[PDB]
């Protein structure tokens, strides 16, 4: 017997978000942008086991990069058998540098979040038995187990957020704000409440691939094995939208280029400032709660405002970037804010930008 499809409860902006973040085209586009062979690795055939074997192949590579073992070519060949790549049916390149090794680790981290979105969408057994089903976009929204509320022009934080975006985004081609959603991923709450005595909270940008937005909404921002960067194995944020916007992988839709950026409330506590790269960091030093790789510039601190979120004051920058003479010789043009516990960040807002 035919099941009834119930009417969609979502507003238009939210329907479009949910369509974009679960789009098979979007996922396959992302895979093509990462040089993956989507014909040999279709979305539905992606598996946790395959991804795990990929990381094992890169771990073997890493060890070889640091005795009569297998050549980098032989070990690369093994990786590429596990994770098929496409380079116009030429040979794929040997993974023979720290930079390329990490680029492959980053590709697998994105692919793991694509696989997470696919597994999330699997039809449960209850759903096969119930006689009415939600509209597909309500179903997909519900799988996130994450409350999203579209804001309008006169939500109390709307102009504050807009100002943060405009004042710290690129001067010439600033991203155009389309929508803001407030994000409440429940049961971030409990772990985040742990740090309630920790002051020094700031609302910070996290730009991302469209392909990992569903994963982030479901699971929060995470520190994954194999993740890394100029400040080590943590979660990375920026006070300058323009820094985070560089990590936005958008998608062409009609005449526009659509992307997503998060704002997270980050309990930074006592900050350790650095001015040179340290990719080997796994934690702040003792008695510190965060590491800030300090940039040549910072949003003018004299213009900081605050929002009140769950009864805590959260600093929100509102100033254009100004020079910080004390970090004029830093290896970082713009600051990178690092935490090394997933509990120190709570997702607060999601922005669609064109
Ligand atoms: C490989 C990919 N990387 C990113 O999403 C990086 C995002 C990002 N990095 C930053 C680094 C410094 C300052 C700001 C940012 C930022 O806003 N986003 C990824 C990492 C971990 N899980 C899934 C995907």
Curated annotation (Swiss-Prot):
Keywords: ADP-ribosylation, Chromosome, Cytoplasm, Cytoskeleton, DNA damage, DNA repair, Glycosyltransferase, NAD, Nucleotidyltransferase, Nucleus, Transferase. The modification ADP-ribosyl aspartic acid is found at residue 35. Interacts with PARP1; leading to activate PARP1 in absence of DNA. Interacts with PRKDC. Interacts with XRCC5/Ku80; the interaction is dependent on nucleic acids. Interacts with XRCC6/Ku70; the interaction is dependent on nucleic acids. Interacts with EZH2, HDAC1, HDAC2, SUZ12, YY1, LRIG3 and LIG4. The keyword rRNA-binding does not apply. Mono-ADP-ribosyltransferase activity of PARP3 is selectively inhibited by ME0328 compound; ME0328 does not inhibit other ARTD/PARP enzymes, such as PARP1. Mono-ADP-ribosyltransferase is strongly inhibited by KU0058948 compound. Residues 135-354 form the PARP catalytic domain. Auto-mono-ADP-ribosylated. GO terms for cellular component: centriole; centrosome; cytoplasm; intercellular bridge; nuclear body; nucleolus; nucleoplasm; site of double-strand break. It is an enzyme of class 2 (transferase). It catalyses: L-aspartyl-[protein] + NAD(+) = 4-O-(ADP-D-ribosyl)-L-aspartyl-[protein] + nicotinamide; L-glutamyl-[protein] + NAD(+) = 5-O-(ADP-D-ribosyl)-L-glutamyl-[protein] + nicotinamide; L-lysyl-[protein] + NAD(+) = N(6)-(ADP-D-ribosyl)-L-lysyl-[protein] + nicotinamide + H(+). GO terms for molecular function: catalytic activity; NAD DNA ADP-ribosyltransferase activity; NAD+ poly-ADP-ribosyltransferase activity; NAD+-protein mono-ADP-ribosyltransferase activity; NAD+-protein-aspartate ADP-ribosyltransferase activity; NAD+-protein-glutamate ADP-ribosyltransferase activity; NAD+-protein-lysine ADP-ribosyltransferase activity; nucleotidyltransferase activity. The keyword Cytoplasm applies. This is Protein mono-ADP-ribosyltransferase PARP3. The modification ADP-ribosyl glutamic acid is found at residues 56, 131-132, 166, 271. Widely expressed; the highest levels are in the kidney, skeletal muscle, liver, heart and spleen; also detected in pancreas, lung, placenta, brain, leukocytes, colon, small intestine, ovary, testis, prostate and thymus. Mono-ADP-ribosyltransferase that mediates mono-ADP-ribosylation of target proteins and plays a key role in the response to DNA damage. Mediates mono-ADP-ribosylation of glutamate, aspartate or lysine residues on target proteins. In contrast to PARP1 and PARP2, it is not able to mediate poly-ADP-ribosylation. Involved in DNA repair by mediating mono-ADP-ribosylation of a limited number of acceptor proteins involved in chromatin architecture and in DNA metabolism, such as histone H2B, XRCC5 and XRCC6. Residues 276-304 are annotated as: Disordered. It is found in: Nucleus; Chromosome; Cytoplasm, Cytoskeleton, Microtubule organizing center, Centrosome; Cytoplasm, Cytoskeleton, Microtubule organizing center, Centrosome, Centriole. Its EC number is 2.4.2.-. Residues 7-122 form the PARP alpha-helical domain. Belongs to the ARTD/PARP family. The gene is PARP3.
């Amino acid at each position: 017997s035919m099941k009834r499809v119930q009417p969609c409860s979502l507003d238009p902006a939210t329907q479009k978000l949910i369509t974009n973040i679960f789009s098979k085209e979007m996922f396959k586009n992302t895979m093509a942008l990462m040089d993956l062979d989507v014909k040999k690795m279709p979305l539905g055939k992606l598996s946790k086991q395959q991804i795990a074997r990929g990381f094992e192949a890169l771990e073997a590579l890493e060890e070889a990069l640091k005795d009569g073992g297998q050549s980098l070519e032989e070990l690369s060949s093994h990786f590429y058998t596990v994770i098929p790549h496409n380079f116009g049916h030429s040979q794929p390149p040997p993974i023979n540098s720290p930079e390329l090794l990490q680029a492959k680790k980053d590709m697998l981290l994105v692919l793991a979040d694509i696989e997470l979105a696919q597994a999330l969408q699997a039809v449960s057994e209850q759903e096969k038995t119930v006689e009415e089903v939600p509209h597909p976009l309500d179903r997909d929204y519900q799988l996130l187990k994450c409350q999203l509320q579209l804001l309008d022009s006169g939500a109390p934080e709307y102009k504050v957020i807009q100002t943060y975006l405009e004042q710290t985004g690129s001067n010439h081609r600033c991203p155009t704000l389309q929508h803001i959603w407030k994000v409440n991923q429940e049961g971030e709450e409990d772990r985040f409440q742990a740090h309630s005595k920790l002051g020094n909270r700031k609302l910070l940008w996290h730009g991302t691939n469209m392909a990992v937005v569903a994963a982030i909404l479901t699971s929060g921002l995470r520190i994954m094995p194999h993740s890394g960067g100029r400040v080590g194995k943590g979660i990375y944020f920026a006070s300058e939208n323009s820094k985070s916007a560089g990590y936005v992988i958008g998608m062409k839709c009609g005449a526009h280029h659509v992307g997503y950026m998060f704002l997270g409330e980050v309990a930074l506590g006592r900050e350790h400032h650095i001015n040179t790269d340290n990719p080997s960091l796994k934690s702040p030093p003792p008695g510190f709660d965060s590491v800030i790789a300090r940039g040549h510039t910072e949003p003018d601190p004299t213009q900081d405002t605050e929002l009140e979120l769950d009864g805590q004051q959260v600093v929100v920058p509102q100033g254009q970037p100004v020079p910080c003479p004390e970090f004029s010789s830093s290896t970082f043009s713009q600051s990178e804010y690092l935490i090394y516990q997933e509990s120190q960040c709570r997702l607060r807002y999601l922005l669609e930008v064109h």
